[PDB]
Amino acid sequence: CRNRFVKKNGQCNVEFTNMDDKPQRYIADMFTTCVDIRWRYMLLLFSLAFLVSWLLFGLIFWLIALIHGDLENPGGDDTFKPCVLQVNGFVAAFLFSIETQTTIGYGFRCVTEECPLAVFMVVVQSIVGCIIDSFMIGAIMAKMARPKKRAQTLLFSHNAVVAMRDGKLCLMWRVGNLRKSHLVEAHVRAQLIKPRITEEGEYIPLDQIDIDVGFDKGLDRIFLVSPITILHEINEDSPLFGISRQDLETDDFEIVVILEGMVEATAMTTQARSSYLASEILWGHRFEPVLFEEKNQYKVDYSHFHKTYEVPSTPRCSAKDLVENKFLLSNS
Amino acid sequence: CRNRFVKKNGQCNVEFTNMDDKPQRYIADMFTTCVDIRWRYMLLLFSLAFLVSWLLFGLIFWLIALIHGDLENPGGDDTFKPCVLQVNGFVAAFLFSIETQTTIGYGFRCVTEECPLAVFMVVVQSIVGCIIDSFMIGAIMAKMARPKKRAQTLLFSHNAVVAMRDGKLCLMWRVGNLRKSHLVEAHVRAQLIKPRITEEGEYIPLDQIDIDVGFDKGLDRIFLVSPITILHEINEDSPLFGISRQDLETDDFEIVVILEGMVEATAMTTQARSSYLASEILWGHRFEPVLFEEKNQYKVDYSHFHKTYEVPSTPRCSAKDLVENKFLLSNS
Amino acid sequence: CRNRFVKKNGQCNVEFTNMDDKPQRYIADMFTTCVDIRWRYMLLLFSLAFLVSWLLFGLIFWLIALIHGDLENPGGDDTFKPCVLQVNGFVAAFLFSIETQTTIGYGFRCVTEECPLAVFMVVVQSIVGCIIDSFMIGAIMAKMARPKKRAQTLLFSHNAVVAMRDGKLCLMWRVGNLRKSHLVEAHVRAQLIKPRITEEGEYIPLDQIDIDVGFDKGLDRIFLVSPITILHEINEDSPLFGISRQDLETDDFEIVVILEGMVEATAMTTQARSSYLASEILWGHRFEPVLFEEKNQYKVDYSHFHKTYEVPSTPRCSAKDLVENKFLLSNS
């Protein structure tokens, strides 16, 4: 009844406060933020940038036109040649700035060979133009390609279960791929979250404790086509070792599950997460099979993914008791 | 005689059904799909987008021209200035929209300083223009660069063999690189696939079982220039431990082989796969050498890659028997 | 009192000298440098490139105009057609070159069907134009996206502490994430730096010695949301094994701490670093908790991140003594 540190969607429930350097540290990493903001903001931002360069140069050109005396003779004649043809005022100067930076260049307003400063400005503005474009491309490219989007076609079981496999008592949860694209170099991790006090009397607000999914033997690496059921064998070195079915409806703790892997197309690691509270773990259940064979191939029924069935055959005590008891019977 | 879970090309034989959230989960990951569809579709899609913005703006301009009364005086005179010169109708309005968004800007149809709304629209459309381009670039860039294409210059042997190496009985298959480019940080994995029932009576439609290629000792990492022969030593902890040559023509199971590595040029992980059925494994054979030395260098003959030869010297029983028997003789 | 090999910001304090091949080796890797230089330099560089192609082609066109005799008849008539209309001199030839390469193409200066060489040149220059753009985009894209920028939203504690946890004496330092974005596949490393002489009398100017953070058990991998305290248990195989609280104010050595992980958005590994001198390590202290629970969620107070408190309960001798002593008492 304490609270949820990671929601079921993987979303983490926490907030940072009194971060001192936040503004100056965010300026240096500035690109990283820019790509996480809503599109409309990233866009409006860029159109803001465009608009600003158009107005700036537009003004310069208008200033030049004003001083040269072009405003009064925009088209020139035999005895007089303007800096930029057909700039009669502000809006005209604005239009030419846009036409130039965008490279539309209708040509009705046009630079002449007269002013080196007008020429120069055109030069500068062109270069400027490319620069802004380049940033926009990259930004869009980057944001467009974010691998965290892939985590939404990855799936966790609504519950985790505990049950026997091959003589061992195991915590299990299930994972699945909702795309026919592969998750490359995928692997998993699990952790038990809960506050604790060390024998020295040190309070750890939330301690994160590894749940061994087979990392040592290289078994945490998975090949995920059909849903895989992930197994934690509860043993001497397990944090759940002394926990029984009744300890599940009493205790407060949380199990955090991770799936890391690479989006096949971009080879960019995505990390998917979810969470099981002690009250979301079903003791004595087993997952319903989603895979079955038909004729020339295999199929997965995904409506059975979350479903579990009761195994009355399941022991209600902790692995600890289970073990210790084995050594009474076997001891006498 | 059951069926093949992964084809020989690496293609997986399975299909997902009754996935509930598929539409809304695919919208969030939408970029990931977009790059896997056939070119013509991704392209037609984008030309569809272009076409749509040209028509949309074209319409706006035509509406503006209509209301301003430009349709009747497209070129204007001393007493009258149009919003956009030379828009006499729909097609004219269309052309200007394209000329503008594409930045061709022939200039025959041209914005004037008269309408702020025409100007604004031009502004908006330009910005819009960049945006669509940017998406196209990224999409093409991404799709163009997909690392899974590299898996087609990587190679597996048509068969796997079992045979003795240095006193040990080993399952072996071969892998090869068809490019002179390196596969960076490459490593392998193998798995035995087959359905099973746990001693608790739990049916696992297909259980995936690790075949140890040396992960523990860091030996699953390979340096692949010439074809490497991959070895699984069949021992106490091997899933093939109790399997003999006769069990091979009887049993139904499958071995799945993986090669993961990085495309040298892009450093993007590609994953190559293939499969050996118990009936594709040749007991008592050995691979033909594809590498030989000549003068100033080494050469690889790839026509010998798949070829195997008989070793009548090979034991036909399981590693299990082989071991157990050693301990009769050595026991008496 | 020797010196600092890595500053606290992670910056390494060292310089390379008498590198022989530096110029020719840097030319081959040239792209890598280009993206690390200040913007203004990368930009000025590119505008330098632009400017150079505009002048080059501008000259060609002017040469062509000169020879054709266009300088004297820029607009032509019934009996004479220029190579490029309206090029009356250098600046005119310059303007057309820019208009062409930038694709502004106002159109006042325009190629005609007369000179195949003018046409060809236009062809060449256009192609050239794209090429330079493409480089600029990539450069900007690349530099824009550098993952090392992310290391500035990652955090280390100003000090490291030594203290007891669960019956063991541990060196600890703390790490934190200043963004709500995740650090994917993150893990840590630590090293003791100091010069030494092997029993063979070989001097190692600075030897780098692994500080075990749990790599073997897969515990060096972390899930970083709230600040994690990193623990080195000082034991038989620890380089700090024979060090006590008094050895800390005497000895000269340095501990180097690393955090490697992936920027969530780009999946590009960043590496963060910092350093603790023996004089920056606080013996007998403990970190102040930055995480606390409120109602519907958790919060982190970052002003407590660096803060430590005294634990007078802490032993002042080395793990070595501590152990050895245990085996007097337990031995008698």
Next chain:
Amino acid sequence: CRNRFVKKNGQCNVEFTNMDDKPQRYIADMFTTCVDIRWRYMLLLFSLAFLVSWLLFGLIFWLIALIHGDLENPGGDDTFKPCVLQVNGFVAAFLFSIETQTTIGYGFRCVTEECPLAVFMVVVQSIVGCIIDSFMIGAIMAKMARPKKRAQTLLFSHNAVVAMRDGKLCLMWRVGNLRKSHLVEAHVRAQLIKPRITEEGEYIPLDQIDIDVGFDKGLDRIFLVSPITILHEINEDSPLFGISRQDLETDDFEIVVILEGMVEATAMTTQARSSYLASEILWGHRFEPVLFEEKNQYKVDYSHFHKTYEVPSTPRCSAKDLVENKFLLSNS
């Protein structure tokens, strides 16, 4: 005296022959090749593509102009409007095609509202135009960014040495970073190459044998600022175990050394290689220190990198003898 499998530059000495599917497998991976070819080829290729689309469309337009009867009335009048203004022939049709696809759009040749087919063609060509650009960008971007270029600022010692460290006999070679940029998540690998015959009489043309650099303890991971000396301790499980100083001037084999790591700026793994023949290994030597301290910092003299000095104190027998002998003395 056999031959070198990897040259000292890392270049591998081998060639593939009789690869059967080479053309069709290379078509699918086609992008991968495109980026490894010389610039001039990738460029000429693209200019080839451009040129081809300009000519193609140019022809279409000319065909349209021909049929419409524009060739005879390029500028039109009150009673007649051309498809595209000012196309009088082939070259004119060519110019307009280029002006259109490049978006220069001088405007002297210009589409009119008359032909829907001309309009359509313009539409199509524009779209086409973007597509080719996009490919070019990506290609240039990709090729520009190749991480294998970084391997040229990474360094190996010209020789490897064997010598005692802390009571153990070790094969050592040295590695170095020629840039002030870091090599992220770097690690090493080594291998002994030589042909062999298994006790079963199976010939392995070249067997690749792991040289343990500490992978098991996680010590193959390095932090490379100053040059690191890499150590292989020659022990029971070492392939060099039974090799002595005299076996070095006799035997033929090769040691292959690898350094894998990530370019700091792009986080793209590069793999550096080199090789030591038994005749390139200096028994009884030690590397000259390249690092020294001065005042406020550290410096590296790179001219000392390759240099080694004699240690007459060094044993000339194999680790094997060395060990076995220890157990005579200690045995009697």
